[PDB]
């Protein structure tokens, strides 16, 4: 099956009106003072007062 007429740009945009993105949950860490994803380990290896990959 295929369309019988063109779809105007208005209907196309009305259909695309549900394609908006959303932001993530970012919080400031209490220990390192850096922005990080909530409930996630910081990129340096720190999470909840603990430090992985001791250097």
């Amino acid at each position: 099956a295929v369309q019988q007429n063109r779809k105007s740009r208005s209907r196309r945009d009305m259909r695309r009106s549900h394609d908006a993105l959303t932001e993530n949950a970012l919080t400031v860490d209490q220990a390192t003072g850096e922005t990080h994803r909530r409930h996630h380990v910081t990129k340096d290896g720190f999470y909840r007062g603990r430090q992985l990959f001791a250097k």
Binding site: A20, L21, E23, N24, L26, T35, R37
Partner: peptide
């Protein structure tokens, strides 16, 4: 992606784009 940072500050936009 460009619609997310339109009108925000530079710090908030950078934080959004990094994660």
């Amino acid at each position: 992606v460009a619609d997310l940072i339109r009108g925000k500050s530079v710090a908030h936009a950078l934080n959004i784009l990094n994660f």
